[PDB]
Amino acid sequence: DVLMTQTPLSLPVSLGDQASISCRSSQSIVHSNGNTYLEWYLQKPGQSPKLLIYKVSNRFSGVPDRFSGSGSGTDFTLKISRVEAEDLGVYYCFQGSHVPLTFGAGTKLEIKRADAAPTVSIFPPSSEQLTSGGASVVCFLNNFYPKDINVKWKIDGSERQNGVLNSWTDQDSKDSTYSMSSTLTLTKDEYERHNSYTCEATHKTSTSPIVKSFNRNEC
């Protein structure tokens, strides 16, 4: 199949900046007829994708001329000359030359702002959950920028790789930060068998991890 690789997958910009998104195909998408069926689509949140550009550089009717498509062969670029707020969303390139028809993974056009370190909070299993027979440890990593972050859980000082579910908020519309929730789910038995519980966050704002911990026995 033809793989459509978009670079980057996340594009932070300020309003009024120029934005460029690359799309590379793994094989040629010049069809046997003369044509290069390379399209660009924009999907805003809660909406269907909308056509911006077809056959590499043809703007669809009603798409403004700050959008431009260019390139050749296996290498294509979408450019926005001055980004408006209405342009934020996920951009997809697409090839309609070879079956299966395929989209790239999507590039999210997002907003730049100053670096912000996450505020990290760790919470033990509640009495309620423990009486119910289970044990979840929760870590919130809130109001950080950039979006890129690593959380690891440790039990008695040792990494715990299994039983972790993460959830991420979209970029905040007011302060342009990101937030994350991580939950380590254990059996009550596992919880009562260990004592030290640690959430640590690695983020570009610190060369050392942010570490939040508690000891079950002291709760």
């Binding site: 079956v99 919470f123 033990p124 979840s136 959830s167 939950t183």
Partner: protein
């Protein structure tokens, strides 16, 4: 104008057969060389092309799903159908009907999409959540802000709604998108207040799961 409107069963179980319909207007599938197809998108994920059907009865399929896909039409009714046999949880997605012509004259591009139909494929039964308070770890404070939380665990179907102090605390709040564990959904929310606010003023997690008629107010008590 041209319009495309999808419909589907909303929810089905794994192993069952998904039957989707696309009803359209403002063009005809008897027009040489008109075509209509289907693309899907799982929540939070990318777009996957599924199948396409042309005015002349020719059909195109995503090879990975050929053994599960059947696309068809009733031109007289202005309808196109997609059947997917043996669906499983991976077929949970929004399914969009799209027009795509075979020539540049009618438009060989996806200009016209429907709003999409969401299909959930789950063997889950209606399941009420447990709601858990998340109080800060002992003890002092020991800074200018305090963060509290609420964990809503093990529900089906979506959604749950969560507020803090009946909505009356509605910033400093981060409520996270639900994730699947099982089978069942789990959601969390944090609220951040000034240290002098709590525990002196009460803070309560208000959770509702409509499908199980569940309503719970969980006060966050200090340790």
């Amino acid at each position: 104008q041209v319009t495309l409107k999808e419909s589907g069963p909303g929810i089905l179980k794994p192993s069952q057969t998904l039957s989707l319909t696309c009803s359209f207007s403002g063009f005809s599938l008897s027009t040489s060389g008109m075509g209509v197809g289907w693309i899907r998108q799982p929540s939070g994920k990318g777009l996957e092309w599924l199948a396409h059907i042309w005015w002349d009865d020719d059909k195109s399929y995503n090879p990975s799903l050929k053994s599960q896909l059947t696309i068809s039409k009733d031109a007289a009714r202005n309808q196109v159908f997609l059947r997917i046999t043996s669906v499983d949880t991976a077929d949970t997605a929004t399914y969009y009907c799209v027009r795509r012509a075979h020539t540049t004259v009618l438009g060989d591009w996806f200009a016209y999409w429907g709003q999409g139909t969401l299909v959930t494929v789950s063997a889950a039964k209606t399941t009420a959540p447990s709601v858990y308070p998340l109080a800060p770890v002992c003890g002092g404070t020991t800074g200018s802000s305090v963060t509290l939380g609420c964990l809503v665990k093990g529900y089906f179907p979506e959604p749950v709604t969560l507020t803090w102090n009946s909505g009356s605390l509605s910033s400093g709040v981060h409520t996270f998108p639900a994730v699947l564990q099982s089978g069942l959904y789990t959601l969390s929310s944090s609220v951040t207040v000034t240290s002098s606010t709590w525990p002196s003023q009460s803070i309560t997690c208000n959770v509702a799961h409509p499908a199980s008629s569940t309503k719970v107010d969980k006060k966050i008590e200090p340790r």
